[PDB]
Assembly symmetry: D2
Homo-oligomer: 463 residues x 4
């Protein structure tokens, strides 16, 4: 529109291209678009003012415009420095939506962008809803703008790491507003986290290095939802995949799924010494992928022992899964192309351009699927963002900020969406594939003790 | 010396069974680690356990583990076709009352169960129940409620059995507390899924020796058993289509690379032949039911199936397939035990060279156990370690010695704590030679767990 | 009163007949050959010496040959591969057959002799069907005069073809032969997909071991090694592959397998020191697939992880040094064709000894020894090639040719690709597949007839 | 600097290309092993090679291996979309004449091949040819047959080019001997299959970022490229159907777990819309042509495909798909380079929010090279080690200098000896850390081979 400058993107001329890709993505997101069409007439989010912090991809564009189509105002930023698709951010800004995001931000630019959503015209925006991915915006609000939380009705957190931070604040009494855990919807956790990484991990590695994967040796650290999806991403390409875990139930699943379970440390004991590193094992690894959400699971001693020219990447939320700090202090970095670096283990000052003793680090340790590719595909993010919309509507309509203190105390929690809504999202996803769900006969529904409409499983069911 | 309190097919198979039990013990490290750890403590001394579960080699290692920990048992199988006779023989030969053989009649099945409940014509002084499917539990509540006054708890193996317990509980008709063994992760996401992955194609190959690559399969259900069964067939190279009523499970099937379809047009089962997607069913070479529901492969579906298609059921009960319709209308030709050609040409007789027949396996009973040996020992290790832990817990709680006011406060259906689930998993991983990494204190602090676990909140779905 | 046979138990015939009727519905290419050649009786006057695993599938092959006019006399080419109900049904039909499951070496030799001799004198045989070359060898060495009446040999398997080619090179082969093995609808169907189906099948029936999560070493990656490797990997085994052929080793790499050697740096010097004891100490299962000699040797057997399974799916048992195990280690029979080999010695064994290996079928081909071999729908391809090869060599009548015309025909050849394609189409139709027909322009564009053959003879598929 | 005998998109991308060249060298052990082995001998001293093959990073390593062995070259790409611009830049910057860029026109493509043939308006004194698809070979035979008098041979990369050579050989129009590089096992059974397995789903993801799991694909053809393409999609969770005209290849698709279908009712392509299986084609989300044939995805098939289906080709030439019909009848909307929405609602104009469109990748050109980067270095290593050995053998044979009677005995289309195929394979295996076992003397004697090989008869199909 004419006069709109309340944004900061890399190249506004990319908007036409981004619009072409948003129009394709709408065709790939039936659950999310079905909610857009379902709630359009009602406008369940009229009056919502949403602070959003999540990877500014084409898929997030569809989510953003869905929220706007339901009545909300939003101010947006990405939750990672390398995850933004610049044509997505351009198309959103061209639509008149405040978005501060580009691919390749510095740490300072990243913090600047979140603050640009928090502040409008040099004063705290009168926001009343928060959509977060990783909890960085939630942390800035609680630590730097706590008075704004007196007007916010709730937070809808996208990812595992963010939910852990919320539960930590709830346990310490420091969480100021209720939240919905979007991550643990089955149409999110067991779809986004697992199948998303199956699609996008080997995608990112091929775009970054164009390395053949078949026949090579991989070590996946972690076998949660992301580790499961990451392991399959590599194994389906023909890699020989070994899996590390601290959780023996997950380790049991890796074994039964056909993976050898190993540890980087002798007998799994990480005493911090070089002698504890299984140097024979790590000397045969061509690719190491961290998937834990933990800290320093690919440490300095492991990086020193890795086979020459191995690829190192992280698909967990934060870069501290790999001890990149050590590599910056001790090893020379040679940039191949954006988000692909050769780390030369021959010393800090300078490198031989034909040196063979280097490692290849992708996205400088940041989420590799979004950093070196485009993250999850639209048809997978459909489930996650459908949940986001439902979670926004529910928390906004509850109107926590307006309740009396006694009613607040009953509502101050971290909850998940009801299974029935989970099932309804899954149903639209299945129809997108052309799948046909069978309806129970009344006699059958009575036999197993469920309604014909569902829910079909008890809340304890793990799928 | 003069042990006669048993009924098996052939006691002379005992030596063979002992040889296979010794092998199975090396495949079951978690169960044997329990046997080693608790042998001296004798935590089941005084326990008198009525056991009703498939009398396989694997159940034999379970039985002898309970006996090793101090228990007395009386045992029957929970399916007429699932017993391995050499395993029943080795257990009888060791002086353990067992009433089980492959190929029981329905009457013999009920009689075997009663032989565990009655000793010398009187009710045995049982105080513990181990059940698989809830048949023994039902007979106890229905025909012997006085025995339940002395029983400290039930440990239920399987999905169908847990559902029947939860129905009794909401109806106020459950008399003793139960432990839901099924919903240990080292049971449900191990036994139910991976076990059927191993044993479904196994049983189909033993029954028919049919090539599976390139042929078309329809799996009804995509719960844990349906997941495992679908993989059992897809890894053989079948083109597998999946049916579901649960849209979340259907979503998983699509993402796992399967076409999700319905036997009925637009998914609507109106009971008429016109509802049958006859085009789809006419292309199916193999159908497998996995639901725990009733009549999910109904008469109209059986009428529409491709000639010479194979029909089998791997859920707990045979009413998933309308076998009664087939007994009533079609002529049965036995190829060999637990393999029948069912001739759709009529009831009275059949032409030996008729081409319009179906092949039914295990007369619609659990096919992995009926036509093969069920799950392998190293998978049943997880399930049966959980059973031993469940039996110790309920026996040590001594529910039946509580006043009526306290019984009411502890009458429930619970699962084992996650810490025990993890410890069973550790011994399973070690059995494969896997090495679990230990968290550093700062790593445990960072994700908010103890170094030793539990590593996941109770909400985690794995 | 037919008595010209010997089987385990003739009362199994009705059961075998029931399974033959099912097998026919799984073998459309073979049954199609019955319908196509029935009226013409192209093997009328043929008298076939047959030596191949007496399975239900072989039963349908036998009766297909008879339906086309032939008389046969049958034995099995392995001591453990007979299905007794199949042999029973063949006998009951009035067909001379000498085969049962669990023959001794002596009885095996006696069974071949019974097919060769009728009433104490050599049968007037004129055709040979063989699987592995044992019948071929006995005729060439013990009854060379019968070969003057025989029009040809149709040899099933890689080991047999290799023996034939040595005799051809050495000028000792008497009659022409058809390499049935190297039809694509045989080698790239039977040897590969067949073992994919039947290797894990046999391991499950013998041991009921979980395979998922365990470590396997497959020795060899030819057609059998390729299918065997896939049989285990699809169950979830972590499979390592050994090879002497770098091209085959390259395929294993690209297929997602780690390529390893039992010997350090791949050099086998015959000493325990050459053994990669750390590799072997992790292996839960080893399978030999080479057709070579002693590829699972004594030093490898000493070094295997306790309680590993050892088995062979090549044609002969000498792939595994079972001789060494019979000499030094105590054998405990678990059940027929399943033995625990106690590495503690030969002076008895502790029934609870933990240091043993499990050997299947005493090293004989394990898919047939501990299960039922390949499924009917796979053997359909192989045995359609066998019938066509029988007709091709029989209609040529080499034994009646003038001497000055025999040299042109004394060879070992494969069937023409047109026959290979004809068998393949019938298999594809068995699966409900629909083959696209080229338009004339498309056929012109790629330079083939619309009728085929569709590939040059150089093509490898 | 001073040197202007090239044309690339952007010479300033050279340092980037050089960085990726250095990485590729570490991924190409067989190609670099020939570089080291023959560097001292200079076996291509005097060779002047015209090269026409996709100007990628992998081709760069091939080009610099030839130069390192003493050759001079003049290079162009064999496809308008397959060049990597940073690779062409690094080559031109190394002083090597190269005429290639991503996104040429058909005129510029021909012009590039002409600029290698001609130096300063006159024909270069070439004596060797390296070709991929036969376009350069065709241009020499038709338009510069005088240059062939002094050329010692052709090394053809791909199946389509070998076919064109064998036609010329049969007709007697082939002027110089050729080596079929394609049919080395370390080429056909590595490049053609495994390469497409890697790069087909890679290209589609880069073009569309479409989820592939759970969607329906139809692969036209099941040769080596079809086999790899089918696996590329199946391994991602697609439901893959396979079409074929060759029953043997069709039998392989069945046994590999694929449903084999024809786009035509009963497989009869009579040229009418009635012959189209509209039901089948209405369910397909992605079609991929792999045939090397013409019009195997015709106009009626395109009219019948599901809305928003993806259409691409990974055969050598774009005429596998009838893109001519689409240019004449439908409106093309460019999403981004090499990605077009083809709106089936008319020829002139389109609604930006129209839903009846197909997505065509690379305008029908080879999708793996057009929308991604083709095969990975470690795979092209095998193909390009064969190319070097092939060039060495034909250049040293010096055909163009041989007596007429010798010319006649050597004018053929031949493959490399199996011993060299094995030697290439061995270096690829060592590149993976694989360990090849050495036969003992007795074992080699038992199977009738040298301990050094070759290990298989020439008839072996692997
Ligand atoms: N990049 C993406 O597209 C994407 C998508 C979803 C989530 N995520 C992020 O990925 C991370 C993992 O998420 P998740 O859903 O898989 O969580 P999860 O809890 O399901 O899995 C993490 C696993 O790591 C294991 N682990 C922890 N410390 C370990 C160590 N030192 N060594 C080995 N294993 C260890 C734990 O046992 C656990 O099973 C989170 O930070 C989440 O926010 C990323
Ligand atoms: N044979 C074995 O070894 C074995 C092992 C474990 C459990 N079981 C039995 O198998 C059954 C299933 O066990 P589970 O743990 O997988 O249960 P589950 O609840 O996880 O799965 C059953 C599935 O069937 C689906 N379903 C229900 N009705 C349906 C219908 N009409 N059509 C299609 N799908 C339908 C449900 O939505 C559900 O996902 C139970 O009877 C259980 O006792 C057998
Ligand atoms: N059991 C069955 O159902 C069945 C079916 C077909 C063939 N076979 C038999 O299996 C054997 C193999 O047949 P094939 O078609 O695979 O032959 P093949 O030539 O295609 O493969 C054998 C492979 O073994 C490799 N090899 C040889 N010695 C080796 C060693 N010491 N270490 C490692 N690798 C070694 C060779 O390089 C070759 O690639 C033959 O004896 C054949 O008759 C058995
Ligand atoms: N893009 C790449 O990276 C790449 C790599 C190698 C080869 N190629 C090219 O791909 C093409 C195929 O090469 P190839 O080695 O697989 O050849 P191939 O001969 O091995 O395979 C082609 C197959 O197509 C089948 N076919 C022909 N017409 C058909 C039709 N109308 N319908 C269905 N199937 C039909 C044939 O029967 C044959 O099996 C050639 O043009 C080749 O140059 C591309
Ligand atoms: N494409 C994507 N868009 C937004 N959030 C994501 N998380 C993972 N992939 C994503
Ligand atoms: N082998 C087995 N033994 C006992 N119960 C089982 N359930 C499934 N397989 C079993
Ligand atoms: K994306
Ligand atoms: K079992
Ligand atoms: K069989
Ligand atoms: K590349």
């Amino acid at each position: 529109p004419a006069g709109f400058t309340d944004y900061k993107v890399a190249d506004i001329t990319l908007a036409a291209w981004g619009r072409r890709e948003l129009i394709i993505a709408e065709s790939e997101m039936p659950a999310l678009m079905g909610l857009r069409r379902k709630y359009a007439g009602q406008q369940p989010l009229k009056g919502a003012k949403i602070l959003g912090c999540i990877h500014m991809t084409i898929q997030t564009g569809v989510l953003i415009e869905t929220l706007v189509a339901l009545g909300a105002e939003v101010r947006w930023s990405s939750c990672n420095i390398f995850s933004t698709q610049d044509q997505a951010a351009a198309a959103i800004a061209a639509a008149g939506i405040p978005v501060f995001a580009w691919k390749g931000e510095t740490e300072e630019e990243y913090e600047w962008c979140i603050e640009q959503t928090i502040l409008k015209d040099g004063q705290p925006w009168d926001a009343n809803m928060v959509l977060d991915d990783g909890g960085d915006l939630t942390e800035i609000l609680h630590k730097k703008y706590p008075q704004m939380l007196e007007r916010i009705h709730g937070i809808t957190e996208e990812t595992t790491t963010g939910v852990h931070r919320l539960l930590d604040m709830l346990k310490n009494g420091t969480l100021k507003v209720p939240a919905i855990n979007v991550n643990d919807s089955v149409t999110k956790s067991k779809n986004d986290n697992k199948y998303g990484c199956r699609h996008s991990l080997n995608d990112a590695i091929k775009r970054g290095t164009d390395h053949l994967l078949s026949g090579k040796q991989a070590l996946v650290i972690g076998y949660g939802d992301v580790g499961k999806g990451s392991s399959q991403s590599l194994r389906q390409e023909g890699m020989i995949v070994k899996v590390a875990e601290v959780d023996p139930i997950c380790a049991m699943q890796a074994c039964m799924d056909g993976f050898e379970v190993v540890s980087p440390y002798k007998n799994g004991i990480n005493d911090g010494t070089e002698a504890s590193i299984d140097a024979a094992l790590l000397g045969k690894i061509d690719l190491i992928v961290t998937t834990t959400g933990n800290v320093n699971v690919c440490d300095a001693n492991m990086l020193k022992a890795l086979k020459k020219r191995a690829v190192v990447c992280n698909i967990g939320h934060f870069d501290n899964e790999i001890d990149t700090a050590f590599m910056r202090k001790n090893w020379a970095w040679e940039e191949v192309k954006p988000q692909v670096h050769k780390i030369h283990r021959t010393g800090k000052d300078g490198f031989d351009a034909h040196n063979d003793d280097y490692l290849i680090l992708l996205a400088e340790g940041r989420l590799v699927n979004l950093g070196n590719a485009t993250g999850h595909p639209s048809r997978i993010m459909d489930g996650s963002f459908a949940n986001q919309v439902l979670a926004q509507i529910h928390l906004f309509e509850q109107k926590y900020a307006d309740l009396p203190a006694a009613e607040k105390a009953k509502r101050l929690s971290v909850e998940v969406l009801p299974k029935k809504l989970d099932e309804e999202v899954a149903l639209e996803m299945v129809k997108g594939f052309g799948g046909v769900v069978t309806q129970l006969t009344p006699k059958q529904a009575e036999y197993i003790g469920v309604s014909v409409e569902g829910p079909f499983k008890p809340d304890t069911y793990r799928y």
